[PDB]
C-alpha cells in the first residue's frame, strides 16, 4: 500500500495478506462534455464532487455534501460511462468495485474485505467508490433461499454507509452505483442511497447530437441529411446509434470485392480505400441491417418505479 | 487493556492477542432532548439507566432493573440515534458490536469473542452493550440453510444473557432491528422490552421541520402546517432530506456551471447570505418522494401488537 | 487441582496446561427444591437418583442401581435451568457446568480430550453431577450434511465415555429442540421428561410466590389474574409482576424533578402499595413470546418418545 | 512396558515416551458368553476364529486358516459391545481397545506412529484381539471434500497395516459411510437384528433373577405388548418396575426418622403385576424404524452374512 498525501501511513496488521492484495487490486482523456444528455446527474456530481474541492467553507451544517447516488435505467444508455468520465475529470482516487471481489472461499472474508475497503477509502483521500451492478450484491434481505454469508455483506454495507459519529474528523467519501433492475433493492439499503435518478432513452435532439459526435474523424459526404436519421431511428437506445455508425462505416468495405482477392492484390486495394468517403447508400443499408434490442417493458417498469420512489 | 475504576486490572491470559484486540477495538455530545417523539423508549431508558445511579436503595428486590430491550420498526425512524444519544448522555462504558466483529475463519473464535465481550462488560462498569442489526446475528435456530458455526454464537448469547445473588454489576443489552419476526424463540424471551417505533404523525413532523432548520436564514413566508399536511408517509430521514434539498435548491437557481476559477469564491459570497424562500420548498417537495411503500410498517405493527411488551 | 475427600491425588501428566485450566474453569446453599412449583415427575426422579442413594446405599444394588442420565425438554421459558441451580444448591456433590463453548479449541485434537478429562475428573472427585446445558448443540444425527470432522469426534467421545467401580456421575441435560438429537445418544439419556406451561392453579401460586415481600393492597383478586393470562409461559408471569410493581414509579412522574428534592420523593414512593390499577394497567402492556406450535411439537415428541 | 512370554523384551527406543504411554494406556471381571441372548452366528464365528486354534493347532495349517477380521452393523442398543467384552473376558488372548480420541496427535506426523506402534505391539504378544470401537470415525471417503491432510495417512496406515495371530473387531451404527477399500479388508460383515417375540421373554426372565417376582408369570403378554423395543429398553422396563415398587410407599415426606425400617419394609417387598402395567405406560422405544431398515438394506446389498 502506498502512502497518502501529507506523508502518513496505514497500519494493516489486523488483516491478512490476500485481503490487502484483493483491495489494493481495485485501485485519461475523457470529459463531461462527452456525455450527451443526462443533465441532472451532471448537476449532482458538480455540486457534490467538484464544488467542495473549491469552496469548502460553504458546505457546512445543513448544506453538507451528499454521500450516495444510484443510477437506474434501461441496459443501453450511459451509466458505466459517467463513472469513468467522473474518474478522469477529477482529483480523487477511484475504487472500482464489482461483485466478484467481495467473494472468498473461507468463512468471514467478504465482510472484512468491505470493512478494509471503506477504511482505505476514508484514509486516503476525498475518494469516491463505484459499485457496479449493485443488484447482484444487495438484494432483498428476507428472501427464500439466500446464503447466510450474503446477509452479512448486506449488513456490512448497512452499518458502514452511515456513520463517522464524531462531528470532527470529516473526510468525505461518495458511493456511486448502477442498476438495470431497481425494484429489487432492500428497503433498508435504498434509504442510504439518496438521490435515486432515472436515465431515459435518448430523444430526437440527443440522437442527432450523438450522430454528429460519433461521425467526426471519418470523412463523410455532404448529402447526408441528419434529420432523417434522427427521425427514423425511433426506439434506438444510446449504445445502438454507435453500432449503426460502425455498420455504416464498414459497409464501405463490404461494397468492394475483398473476399475475391484472397491475399494476392489485397494490400494494394487497401491503399486507396482509407480516403474513400461514406455516401448515403451505406447509411441506407445500415438502417436496413440493424434492429434495436427492443422490448420496452423493462423501460416502462423502471420508469414507473423511479416515478413512484425516486428523488431527483 | 486499560484499567477500570478503583484501580483493578483484568487478567486476560487464556485468550490470544487478536481476540483481545478485536474486543478492544469496539469500545457529538448530543442530548436526549433532541430526539423527536418516542416517549416510552425514553421512559424505559430513563428507569433502566438514569435512576439506578442516583438512588440505588429503591431497585433492590422485585424491582431489579431491566436487562435488555429491542427496538423494532420500519427503516429510518430513530433507533441508532437513540443509541448514540444514550452513549452521549450517560456515564457508562459503551460497546458497539456488529455482525462483523464476531466472525473469524478459525474454529472456535466466534464463540470466544462473545464470551470475552460479556466478561469485559461485567468487569468494567455499569456498561451498556449495543448490538446492531441483531436479525443478522440471531436467526431462527432449527432452520434449513444454517452453517454449524452460527449455532454456537446463538447458544453463547443464550447462555451469557441470563446469569448468584452477589455480583451486582450491571449490563444492559440494547438491540435494534427492522425485521423482528426472524428472532429465535429462546432469544425473543430475553429481551423483556420489545417496543415498537412508529412513523411520525402530522404533529411530530412540524417539530422535526422546525428543529432541522435552525441555523440557515429563512424567510417569514413559509407556513409549516401546509408542509406538515402535504407530507404523508414520510419517515424522519426523508423529512431531513427534504430540508436539505431546499437549501441546495437555493444554490441551484444561479448558474454556477459557468464561472471557471476566476473569483468564484467572491461569487459565492453573495450566495451565502440569501434566504430560503417558499419556491425552494415547492420545488424540493416535488423533487423528493418516500423511499418505500407501506408493507413492512404494517407487518411490524401486526407483530408488535401481539408479541410485544411495551 | 484440589484434592478430593479422603486425601487422594490426581496425576494430570499426559495433558497440556491449558486443558486442565479450562476444566477447572468449568468447576452456596441458597435455593431449595420448594421454590420451584409444579414439576412433580422430575422432582421424583431427582429424589430417587440424587438424594436417596446417599441415605441408604445398601438398597440401590443390582437391578435397582440408580439412574444415570436425564433430559429436560420443552417450551423455551418454563424453568429447566432453575432446577439445575436448585439441585446444585441443595446437594453435597461436586457440580460441574459445561456449556457448548468449553469444548472448542482451534488446534486439532484438543476438543475430544477436554471431554475425557471432564469425565475422569468427575469420576475421581466425588459422587458428582454434570450439567450439559443446550444439548441440541453437540447433538444431531451423525449422517448429517455440513458436519465438521472434529464435531463428530466430540460426539464419539461422548458416546464411548457414557457407558460402563461404585462411583456415580449423573449427567443432566436441558434443551428446547429435542427432535434434533442423535439416535445413539438419546438412548443413553434413560429418562426423557416433558415440562408444560403452567395450568390455572399453578399460575396463582406463581403470582403469590413472586409478589410476597413487596407491600400491596388487600383488594387484588388473584383468581381473575390467574384465569386472565391463559397462555403465559411461566417466565412471563414474573415479567407481569415486575411491570405491575414498577408502575407505581410511572404514576408519580419523576421525569420532571431532576435532583431538586427528588431523593425524598423516592422515599415517599418507597412504601406505596401496589393497587389494582397497577395490575389492570400492566395487563395491557405484557404479552407472551407466543407461537404455541413449538409447545405442540415438543408435546408430540415427548408423548411419542418420552419415558417418564 | 512389561515383558512378554518366554522372557524376551521389546525395544521401543525410536519412539517418544508419550506415544508408548498412549498405546500402553489402552491395554478380568468375569462375564460369560452364555450371558448374551441371541446372536448364535456371531458366537459361531468367534468360536471358530478364537477358541479352536488354541486346542487344535494342527488342523489350521494351510487353506483352512481362520478369519482375521469382523465388523458388526446394526441399530443402537442391540448389544455390540457386550460381545466384545465377553470375548475379552474369557480368553487368554491379550486384549486392546482403540477409539477415535486415542489417535488425537496434535503434532504433525504422529498419528501414524501411534497406529504402527499398536500393530507392532499386537504382533509381539502372540495371541491378540483388537477392538476398534465406532469405526464410523476415521472411515470417511479418502477423497472427500472437507478433509485434513493427516486423516488420509491414518486410513492409508490401516490399509497397509492390516496385512503371530491378530484379530480385529469393529462396530457401527451407520455402516454405509464406510469406505470401499476399507470394506473389502473385513472378511465378515454381519447384521445384528432387533429382538423377536421369543428373545424378549428370555430377556425379561433373565434380567429379573435377583428381585423376587411372585405370580406375574404372564411373560407372553409382556413379550406381546412391547412391539418394537430395541433390546436395551426391556432392561429399562424391569428397572422401572423395581423403582415403581419403591414409588408406591410415599417416601418424600419422611425426614431422616424411620428411613431405615421403612427401607427395610421395602427390602422384602415383592413385585406385583400392577407395577409392570404401570411401567408399560411410561416406557417408549428410543427411536423409530428407520435406521433398522437402512442397515438392513445395506447388509442385503453388501453384507457377506
Amino acid at each position: 500500500l502506498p502512502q497518502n498525501s501529507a506523508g502518513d501511513s496505514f497500519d494493516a496488521s489486523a488483516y491478512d495478506a490476500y485481503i490487502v492484495q484483493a483491495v489494493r487490486g481495485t485501485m485519461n482523456t475523457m470529459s463531461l462534455d462527452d456525455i450527451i444528455g443526462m443533465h441532472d446527474v451532471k448537476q449532482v456530481l458538480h455540486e457534490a464532487v467538484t464544488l467542495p474541492l473549491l469552496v469548502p467553507e460553504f458546505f457546512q451544517g445543513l448544506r453538507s455534501p451528499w454521500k450516495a447516488m444510484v443510477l437506474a435505467g434501461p441496459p443501453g444508455t450511459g451509466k458505466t460511462l459517467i463513472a469513468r468520465a467522473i474518474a478522469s475529470e477529477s482529483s480523487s482516487t477511484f475504487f472500482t468495485v464489482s461483485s466478484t471481489d467481495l467473494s472468498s472461499k473461507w468463512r468471514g472474508d467478504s465482510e472484512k474485505i468491505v470493512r478494509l475497503l471503506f477504511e482505505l477509502a476514508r484514509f486516503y483521500a476525498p475518494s469516491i467508490i463505484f459499485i457496479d451492478q449493485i443488484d447482484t450484491l444487495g438484494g432483498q434481505r428476507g428472501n427464500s433461499g439466500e446464503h447466510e454469508a450474503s446477509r452479512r455483506v448486506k449488513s456490512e454495507f448497512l452499518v458502514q454507509m452511515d456513520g463517522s459519529q464524531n462531528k470532527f474528523d470529516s473526510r468525505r467519501v461518495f458511493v456511486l452505483a448502477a442498476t438495470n433492475i431497481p425494484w429489487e433493492l432492500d428497503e433498508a439499503l435504498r434509504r442510504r442511497f439518496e438521490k435515486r435518478i432515472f436515465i431515459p432513452l435518448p430523444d430526437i435532439d440527443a440522437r442527432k447530437k450523438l450522430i454528429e459526435k460519433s461521425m467526426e474523424g471519418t470523412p463523410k459526404s455532404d448529402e447526408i441529411n441528419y434529420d432523417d436519421l434522427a427521425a427514423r431511428t425511433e426506439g434506438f437506445s444510446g449504445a445502438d446509434v454507435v453500432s449503426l455508425c460502425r455498420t455504416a462505416a464498414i459497409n464501405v468495405l463490404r461494397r468492394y470485392d475483398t473476399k475475391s482477392l484472397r491475399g494476392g492484390e489485397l494490400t494494394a486495394a487497401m491503399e486507396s480505400l482509407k480516403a474513400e468517403l461514406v455516401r448515403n447508400i451505406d447509411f441506407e443499408a445500415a438502417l436496413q441491417a440493424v434492429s434495436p434490442s427492443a422490448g420496452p417493458d423493462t423501460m416502462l417498469k423502471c420508469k414507473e418505479w423511479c416515478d413512484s420512489f425516486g428523488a431527483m | 487493556l486499560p484499567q477500570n475504576s478503583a484501580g483493578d486490572s483484568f487478567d486476560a491470559s487464556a485468550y490470544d492477542a487478536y481476540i483481545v484486540q478485536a474486543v478492544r477495538g469496539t469500545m457529538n455530545t448530543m442530548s436526549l432532548d433532541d430526539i423527536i417523539g418516542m416517549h416510552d423508549v425514553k421512559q424505559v431508558l430513563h428507569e433502566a439507566v438514569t435512576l439506578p445511579l442516583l438512588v440505588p436503595e429503591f431497585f433492590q428486590g422485585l424491582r431489579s432493573p431491566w436487562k435488555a430491550m429491542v427496538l423494532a420498526g420500519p427503516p429510518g425512524t430513530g433507533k441508532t440515534l437513540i443509541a448514540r444519544a444514550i452513549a452521549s448522555e450517560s456515564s457508562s462504558t459503551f460497546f458497539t458490536v456488529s455482525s462483523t466483529d464476531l466472525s473469524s475463519k478459525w474454529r472456535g473464535d466466534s464463540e470466544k469473542i462473545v464470551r470475552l465481550l460479556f466478561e469485559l462488560a461485567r468487569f468494567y462498569a455499569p456498561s451498556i452493550i449495543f448490538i446492531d442489526q441483531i436479525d443478522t446475528l440471531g436467526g431462527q435456530r432449527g432452520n434449513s440453510g444454517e452453517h454449524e458455526a452460527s449455532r454456537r454464537v446463538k447458544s453463547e448469547f443464550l447462555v451469557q444473557m441470563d446469569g448468584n445473588k452477589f455480583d451486582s454489576r450491571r449490563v444492559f443489552v440494547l438491540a435494534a432491528t427492522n425485521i423482528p419476526w426472524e428472532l429465535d424463540e429462546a432469544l425473543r424471551r430475553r429481551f423483556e422490552k420489545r417496543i415498537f417505533i412508529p412513523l411520525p404523525d402530522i404533529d411530530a413532523r412540524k417539530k422535526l421541520i422546525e428543529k432541522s432548520m435552525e441555523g440557515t436564514p429563512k424567510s417569514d413566508e413559509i407556513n409549516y402546517d401546509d408542509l406538515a399536511a402535504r407530507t404523508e408517509g414520510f419517515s424522519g430521514a426523508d423529512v431531513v432530506s427534504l430540508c436539505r434539498t431546499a437549501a441546495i435548491n437555493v444554490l441551484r437557481r444561479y448558474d454556477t456551471k459557468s464561472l471557471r476559477g476566476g473569483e468564484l469564491t467572491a461569487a459565492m459570497e453573495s450566495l451565502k447570505a440569501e434566504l430560503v424562500r417558499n419556491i425552494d420548498f415547492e420545488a424540493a417537495l416535488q423533487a423528493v418522494s418516500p423511499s418505500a411503500g407501506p408493507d413492512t410498517m404494517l407487518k411490524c405493527k401486526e407483530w408488535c401488537d401481539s408479541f410485544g411488551a411495551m | 487441582l484440589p484434592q478430593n475427600s479422603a486425601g487422594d491425588s490426581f496425576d494430570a501428566s499426559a495433558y497440556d496446561a491449558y486443558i486442565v485450566q479450562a476444566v477447572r474453569g468449568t468447576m452456596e446453599n441458597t435455593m431449595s427444591l420448594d421454590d420451584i412449583i409444579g414439576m412433580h415427575d422430575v422432582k421424583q426422579v431427582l429424589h430417587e437418583a440424587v438424594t436417596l442413594p446417599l441415605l441408604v446405599p445398601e438398597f440401590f444394588q443390582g437391578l435397582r442401581s440408580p439412574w444415570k442420565a436425564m433430559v429436560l425438554a420443552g417450551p423455551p421459558g418454563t424453568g429447566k435451568t432453575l432446577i439445575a441451580r436448585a439441585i446444585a444448591s441443595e446437594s453435597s456433590s461436586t457440580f460441574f457446568t459445561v456449556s457448548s463453548t468449553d469444548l472448542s479449541s482451534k488446534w486439532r485434537g484438543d476438543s475430544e480430550k477436554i471431554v475425557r478429562l471432564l469425565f475422569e475428573l468427575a469420576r475421581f472427585y466425588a459422587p458428582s453431577i454434570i450439567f450439559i446445558d443446550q444439548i441440541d448443540t453437540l447433538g444431531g444425527q451423525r449422517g448429517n450434511s455440513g458436519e465438521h470432522e472434529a464435531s463428530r469426534r466430540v460426539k464419539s467421545e461422548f458416546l464411548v465415555q457414557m457407558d460402563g467401580d461404585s462411583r456415580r456421575v449423573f449427567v443432566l441435560a436441558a434443551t428446547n429442540i429435542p427432535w434434533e438429537l442423535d439416535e445413539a445418544l438419546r438412548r443413553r439419556f434413560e429418562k426423557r421428561i416433558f415440562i408444560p406451561l403452567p395450568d390455572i392453579d399453578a399460575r396463582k401460586k406463581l403470582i403469590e410466590k413472586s409478589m410476597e415481600g413487596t407491600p400491596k393492597s388487600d383488594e387484588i383478586n388473584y383468581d381473575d389474574l390467574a384465569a386472565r393470562t391463559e397462555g403465559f409461559s411461566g417466565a412471563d408471569v414474573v415479567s407481569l409482576c415486575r411491570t405491575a410493581a414498577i408502575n407505581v414509579l410511572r404514576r408519580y412522574d419523576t421525569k420532571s424533578l431532576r435532583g431538586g428534592e427528588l431523593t425524598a420523593a423516592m422515599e415517599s414512593l418507597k412504601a406505596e402499595l401496589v393497587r389494582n390499577i397497577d395490575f389492570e394497567a400492566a395487563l395491557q402492556a405484557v404479552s407472551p413470546s407466543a407461537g404455541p406450535d413449538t409447545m405442540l411439537k415438543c408435546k408430540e415428541w415427548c408423548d411419542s418418545f418420552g419415558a417418564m | 512396558l512389561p515383558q512378554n512370554s518366554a522372557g524376551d523384551s521389546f525395544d521401543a527406543s525410536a519412539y517418544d515416551a508419550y506415544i508408548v504411554q498412549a498405546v500402553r494406556g489402552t491395554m478380568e471381571n468375569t462375564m460369560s458368553l452364555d450371558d448374551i441372548i441371541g446372536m448364535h452366528d456371531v458366537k459361531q464365528v468367534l468360536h471358530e476364529a478364537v477358541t479352536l486354534p488354541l486346542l487344535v493347532p494342527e488342523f489350521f495349517q494351510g487353506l483352512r486358516s481362520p478369519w482375521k477380521a469382523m465388523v458388526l452393523a446394526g441399530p443402537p442398543g442391540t448389544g455390540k459391545t457386550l460381545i466384545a467384552r465377553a470375548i475379552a473376558s474369557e480368553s487368554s488372548s491379550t486384549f486392546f481397545t482403540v477409539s477415535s480420541t486415542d489417535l488425537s496427535s496434535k503434532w504433525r506426523g504422529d498419528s501414524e506412529k501411534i497406529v504402527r506402534l499398536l500393530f507392532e505391539l499386537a504382533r509381539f504378544y502372540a495371541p491378540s484381539i483388537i477392538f476398534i470401537d465406532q469405526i464410523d470415525t476415521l472411515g470417511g471417503q479418502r477423497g472427500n471434500s472437507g478433509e485434513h491432510e493427516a486423516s488420509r495417512r491414518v486410513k492409508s496406515e490401516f490399509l497397509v497395516q492390516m496385512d503371530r495371530r491378530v484379530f480385529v473387531l469393529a462396530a457401527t451404527n451407520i455402516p454405509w459411510e464406510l469406505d470401499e477399500a476399507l470394506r473389502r479388508r473385513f472378511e465378515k460383515r454381519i447384521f445384528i437384528p432387533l429382538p423377536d417375540i421369543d428373545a424378549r421373554k428370555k430377556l425379561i426372565e433373565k434380567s429379573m433373577e435377583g428381585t423376587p417376582k411372585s405370580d406375574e408369570i404372564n411373560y407372553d403378554d409382556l413379550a406381546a405388548r412391547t412391539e418394537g423395543f430395541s433390546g436395551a429398553d426391556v432392561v429399562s422396563l424391569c428397572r422401572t418396575a423395581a423403582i415403581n415398587v419403591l414409588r408406591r410407599y410415599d417416601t418424600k415426606s419422611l425426614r431422616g426418622g424411620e428411613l431405615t425400617a421403612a427401607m427395610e419394609s421395602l427390602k422384602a417387598e415383592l413385585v406385583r403385576n400392577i407395577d409392570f402395567e404401570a411401567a408399560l405406560q411410561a416406557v417408549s422405544p428410543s427411536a423409530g424404524p428407520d435406521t433398522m431398515l437402512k442397515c438392513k438394506e445395506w447388509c442385503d446389498s453388501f453384507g457377506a452374512m
Partner: peptide, 12 residues
Amino acid sequence: EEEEEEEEEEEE
C-alpha cells in the same frame, strides 16, 4: 515441531 490448526469453509 509443526503444530496443526483447523479452519472453516463454506459451500454451495
